[model samples]
Target: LTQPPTITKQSAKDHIVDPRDNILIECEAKGNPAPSFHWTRNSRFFNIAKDPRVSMRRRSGTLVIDFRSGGRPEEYEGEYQCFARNKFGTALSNRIRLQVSKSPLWPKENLDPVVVQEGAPLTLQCNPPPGLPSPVIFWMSSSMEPITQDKRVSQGHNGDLYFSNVMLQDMQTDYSCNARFHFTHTIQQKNPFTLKVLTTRGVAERTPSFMYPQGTASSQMVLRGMDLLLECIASGVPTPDIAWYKKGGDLPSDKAKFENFNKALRITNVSEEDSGEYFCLASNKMGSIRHTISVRVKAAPYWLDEPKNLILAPGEDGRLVCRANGNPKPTVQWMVNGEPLQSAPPNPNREVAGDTIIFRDTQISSRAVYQCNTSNEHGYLLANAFVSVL
Candidate 1:
């Protein structure tokens, strides 16, 4: 009597998609006495009389079913088994389950948005849908070549690309990111994301000048011992570095002080010797710009007897003159009692006559402090005077 064939193991565990995009399922079985091969479905052995999608072939004692079933979800919806038989008897392999799946879709397949400033760090974000698990992300240039790991270009958190400091050369090119996913069944490819990198240039700019309290310049007479002050103001994209130099020479480090606020430079304790071609140099990684001011410290005029006792009358035209010379012509503005004086159009009572600021008719209420502020491209100077209207 022949012994029954004992099946040890049967069934394909890992199934994968074919390169041709077709579903492929491999079946394996081991049995005693070498088994003749046959494939079955729904408990019926595959026969020439059965469906065309099922076919069988034999190799050694193992059986293989070249199921030419079209790669479709419906074809793999059922269970299948491989049967083997020899003179010893017959055995069947374990039931193998086949599944077909579509590849993941790529919604954001475009390049990431990036912002780069000249001589500053540049950052770019490449985002992929979180729906795919165990996704592999990589970046490449538009030429399809891999980007080298350099200090300037690097991969960041969660697939974000970064350029440490961007320059003009980094702009005007295309960049792409690829995300890949490997499934138990097949390798899935998602859409490629792309972007054009841009460089920011000529954005950072600077302007330098000065300002002073009103009525300060017009009324005050230069006194030998009186301390005079000057302030420099500048504005730009990146905060500008300001330094005050006299006649192209460094100012006394102890006497020359620098104060900065929101890109503005202020110089205080201006002395007669401190007066000269003062240079306000502003700089950044992009470039450097300089403003020059020639300050002339004038001795108090002989006609002026009192330093702070000058006064003018109201209801009568009064003239006040304050002058300073600088590289760029100085602009003069007047203020009374700390408030900016408003310009009046040809008013008989108030007018600006030439360099002399005039008050046609003065009033008792008009007795107040007056200051003049003069500024030019190079720097600024200020003076003050008082008036009495009774």
Candidate 2:
């Protein structure tokens, strides 16, 4: 059965690139006939073949771009979108920005040694160097290992290191802040701070709370066979541990995956069984918070049995059948000669039952164009058949 195009995958909203660097913008779609892909740059149609540095993989909808020495980098930076189309219709993908970034290094200054009393709060400033899109700031230990945030020590929203309560063990190593430029593929580090934790104790703990709490449950809908992504962000005196589970059932372990230090959950190729209420719980030594998400899976009608044309003679019996499948279970209807097929009064020699139309005794008048239509809340499908009685 023929079907309209649907975009299944597209590039993220922004792509950071350095000068003289190549990048690929992704766009994928699905349809019965397999649609062809085209792109729009800056709201205008882009001629990929016209530029030697850019080429598109027609079958896979991938745009491979080259940033050679000849042209200005600004020419390659702009908004882009992909269109997949067949005879049925066109499908548009999300628009994305191609940004060219140039990041600078940190200054030669070093942070002074710090001496904090045990159980006292402490903060280390990151103060990242300036650049386009801003650098990703993180902390590293004297051993050159990226710091793993824990209950007492965590990175703040402003890229600062916060210690709810300093401990003697923290003095084991020095700490340094680093700036990461994703597009430029470069890193810069500030001199390390020599920490000295004093001997003392007397501070209260704080409970975990959502950075932006969820006031009400949220719902998201996804088409069957698509991937679903959920994310949770929380904060506490100590870093919160994140976990995911279905409200009343277990997650589909075979298809479920976690990323971003288990802060994000993903389920691939979802089916009807995946539909349910899901929750993400974040807990720490202090307390816990949770968020709820309701997922609804729907489907576009697809054919199970499609009607075919038939030829018969006088007194011949013929039947045409059409059936389709969808999430809500598609409903079927029949049409003859471009008009709704009448069945209420009932045709003497013609009968409509369920998804089939029966011709008890074929006559010359039975020769006409027929159509089977099926539809649901998600989508619709149509099929046509012809009968010739001699």
Candidate 3:
């Protein structure tokens, strides 16, 4: 030998996807003394001769081994060291560790409601338990659309969602969280969130004339999953009794949270279901003011259902449709695998419309994976579909 043995990543490194496959550790070195090797399983020497699954080879300064299968994969999940020595001197390479494991791994979390204040900032934590192979946390609206992060809103590496300011309009709506553990490549949702926007702004003194209004017929538009502040103030000798109503019945909301006497109506976390004309009433002995505002909740495009894989006969036309809806208009794009494909009704075979991909006269060439991407300022979604040509 002419060099000292060295070990690099291969079967020797960690993060093994399967356990039944062959386990191999390797080392390379240069020197003399016919470089023999040492196997240290712990402080104790590993017996390569006893274990047939465990074998070693040193050729031209490189060393390799087959972790020899004997016990369960878990038995080989620990650290093992391989070093070489010679007549010149004994050489011990740093311990090389490897694991052969096909065990299933996953992250853990729960949907537990949390209370928050109105007009103050808040953060939502996606609590994950300590485990091997760390997971990634993501936040999405109840709509299942990705939440766009901005100066006022952001997500941290630790899986915490931070809101710079919380408004009364930010309460009582669902803001969902999810986590992705890489080994499994699957995502899950946490469906629990609650907020109580406590405010003393109540009781329009007289009537609804003092609402934050450009006009009595004015309307307020808000984004889905954000906060909304609709106040109906008034002036009267004795403060008027304030109440809020929807189309048919009185608004069923927490009085301590989003409703006030006659001053303010806040929805801490507004959803599409909250979009409508609100009837605000301030009544006293004198009279009642019917104050109202049209609340329109703007939403980003979300897939009610993603496109599915389809098999088509050769030379046939196939339709790839994507269904999505949003307040701010969304745009859909088509991609063959990863490249942008702007196929017009070219020959009535290949065309790209708003939410569908048309492939006419499909051939084996057209039978590959395709991606449907939908995007708006607030959210983005990408899904894959495979076209198998039979």
Candidate 4:
């Protein structure tokens, strides 16, 4: 009896309306059985049942208000809410305030421009026009293309544009802020912000240089399943683009994370296969430079081959092999019963190889258990074999 309803999208917090204009407020919801949409005006259940000018869309749950059909703009000015309900439960949306707006124009004053020296910070104010709901402000170039933001240049929270360390290129273009009035569907642009970036120092190119690690190369040792971090900080006239690469192969794009504007590289859960020489290059229009780092990964010994039980007939021969692999290269040794094979009683019939022990002439005396030990600086491994001669 209950497939709960979940509201997905609600109307904007504030909406501006005008006389003789049609407006639509949106509401979206999801439910197992498809929830029905509803609206409330000024804390009262909306009565769209008798008003033809006000209607709610069937599927999208959009409220349509037709002021041109003889509805007063002020009558719609109040707080509204959306409700989505199914047999299981009902969900309510946040309150939305609607207000009437009178179309206004931006006043033309203070037509003067701004001038700043290169490498200095600057801010351009967005003197917006008056409206019921303050106009939305955004910056654009004279060519109508929207201005892009970055670490050095970005839009401020208060509808202003900020530039950190103004560049000579900033003076080449004209900028303006566009204001949009949602109620009247009107758009206006403020006076162009004529920028003059003065370069005190002569314009010249400079090559990139390493600011950190102060050296050409460095080395790092890390254990398996740990993160490896490599930082390469560079400075130059113009900011450079940093790129990371391995000596003989491509860095795993999915595993390598570039942080701090590509100035650092981090690989998580590094394995033996990730150990190699890595380099980061900083490049710009002037020149390029790089630094290299060698990564070493150490891991515990793992088995490549293990000894197994062996049964030999009279006058037969057998051998037990135990081998392992690790980053530091594990060493192998032989043991008979519980004592080291090298110190045990000498047997002319048995001979010990690097990773294996060979029984030259198998007899009843060779029926004891044998063990192989392999170890490295990281960890060690042991294997046992039962030898039987019939």
Candidate 5:
């Protein structure tokens, strides 16, 4: 039996140190079988066992990272992640960002707060002070989702956020910006009200006002032949008309094309050709808005490219391959002679490898009907093959 890993302590929220000094990061977790730790930055591994500058160890329940002096911030800084895994499963830690900054010097450029009247444009400066390597800038919304589609939120470039027709109703929130160093793939979240929206509600609207608002929904990945509906809901006065578009082409305007009320797209028997980018356009005389998402269609599991029925010469070594495609490649769940094999182990007769089951030193006893079953979030599939040794 196994219990998943849980961290009792997290690394510091902020660390400012001189470039010449060493730094330490730590996160500790406990699980049955003493979970192993995997540390990475920007999805790349940190070779703790090989790199002299980076040494890792667990001390008193702390996963300690000792970064020896000499490496530049570009090499040591950015987003560092901690993962612990054992036979049961793996657990992850929150992000830890490392950086070199003066004790009193700010890491990012200063931006003064601003006030804007309704319907006016607003810009938020997000450029971080120059570092050894360039930084990747992204806007962080305090709300549930990143800003998009709304007419008031304009997509700004290179460390800046712009908004147009700023509404008093949406101004009650603060914004944070993140700047990740490209080389280290480490990240820092610069917090503040530098982009405060003065959402103090005001006089009623002349044009349409949303009773039901539409927000960005994350992208969808569905299995082939699956039924899908992408919903984009917004109810407003002057009754904003909504339209759905796919792969840059607008669908027929007739109500018959819509699946649900007018806000959702009903895609049936979705295939690979139907996969691509989709957007919802909602418009009115006062203003218009567009929201987008990427749609990926995965080929479902089937008997494709499976091991074939075959006869092996006596005492021969034979390989049986089973493969299938989907958003996630299939894995092996085995059965023999229609019976699930639980305490299964490899012997002089049979063995298993990734995506394949093997017959080793085959003999007459190595003959049987075998099944390969696999699945991912999208769906599941199974196939069978018979092997015989003559």
Candidate 6:
């Protein structure tokens, strides 16, 4: 019988993309004993395990394979090695590297709140994420009017937008930044930012003034059953009329009892629903001024089921956060042995914390009734958790 002869061939390298059609590969090899066919990718050898997308045939002492790339684009960009082996030995064909080309994508940059004195020049910087080539930037006003190229508006090469003599006209105006890559034809728009111009002006000489305990004005009080006092003062050219609002809406007279003092408005018996944006609108022809305050109401904390209890283990640091949905964030406090814990910075042994309480290397002494207290001028609520040291 005639013995199978050795095989040899020319170049056998190529590159392809996923979902490729009509693909072909040619391989030739020589062996003292006729060589067999085998193909591998990423150092893994395969035979019948080949997917239906690939097929191989031997013709004219040459190995030809027709296949379609079915994997993701990234997978098709790896090295593919052809192995030729027989009773003699195995030979690895030079690795073939594949790469894919696509357009670049950019994300809109969020500009920080700009603080500039009235009549002062203000410049805002909008930068795209690094690694992307330079892109075209466009700026617009809240009215969607073209702002770039205007004499009052200056554009910079480094993607900065400047406004000269920023005035009340610019206050509360929406500013937007857009970036486009000419090469890739990709464009992205960032979320709009509202510019708030803070001006320093002495309270109108005629304006009224209200006073309360140091922390009481901004502090929390128990709700419903809890009784707290809130005072609003207004002064204007002709003594401005003062009115109170609860939760962004007008407070009902029945639920909100008001006591009037010369120029002050006091509301007593605050409730949970009463917590929210509170402002005094003082007007008396000389023009109206709005003084706003935020109130947050607290509720009892929900019970931590068994599964959640595990996440708050002793020794390992954790947080006891009390998130009360209110206008102003609620104030949280920790308690031990029926006494309110003094607020202190985090310590190595004990950390007096709120929003998040961390305990390091917890001991039996660390076990106590932890309470999260939240309040506003309206009312207050308390949630407690019993920590047991293991």
Estimate, for each residue in 275-353, the C-alpha lDDT of model 3 and write its tens digit: 7888667675667777778888888667877887667788877788887887777778765534466642223355667
What's the TM-score of every candidate structure?
0.33, 0.45, 0.40, 0.38, 0.38, 0.27
lDDT scores of the candidates, listed in order: 0.47, 0.73, 0.58, 0.72, 0.59, 0.50
Give per-residue CA lDDT, model 1, range 1-390, as digits (tens). Answer: 122333444446323332335443444434334555665554554463354544444543333334445534445445555544544223444455444433455564544455545645444556654532345667766566676644335554356665534556665455666666555343333333333335555444434222221221212223233454443333334534555555656767665444423222233444456555555555545565565554555442222111131244545667566665533356777655334667422234455654466565665544444556665553334344554544
Candidate 2's residue-wise lDDT over 288-379, tens digit each?
87889888989878777778766677789999988887988898877663346773323577777979988888775565556676868876
Tens-place lDDT per residue, model 5, 70-115, is 5565466677766655443344554566666522224654546766
TM-score of 3: 0.40
Off by over 4 Å in 4: 1-212, 221-228, 234-241, 253-261, 267-276, 283-288, 296-301, 311-316, 326-329, 346-349, 360-365, 377-379, 388-390
Q: Is 1 or 3 the stronger prediction by TM-score?
A: 3
Sliding window of 10 residues with minimal summed lDDT for model 4: 1-10
Q: Tell me how candidate 4 scores on lDDT.
A: 0.72
Q: Judging by lDDT against the true structure, name the best candidate.
A: 2
Q: Give per-residue CA lDDT, model 4, range 313-385, as digits (tens).
A: 8688888878787878898877665457779867777878778788878876665556566767965665556
Stronger candidate by TM-score (5 vs 6): 5
Q: Model 5, which residues run further than 4 Å from truth?
A: 1-206, 209-213, 216-221, 247-256, 260-262, 271-276, 294-300, 311-319, 337-353, 358-362
- Cα lDDT of model 6 by residue, 305-382, tens digit: 211121234567654555565434455555442245674222464665456665667654554445555654433444
Kindly report which residue stretches of model 2 are placed more than 4 angstroms away from their true locations once superposed.
1-205, 309-314, 337-349, 363-369, 388-390
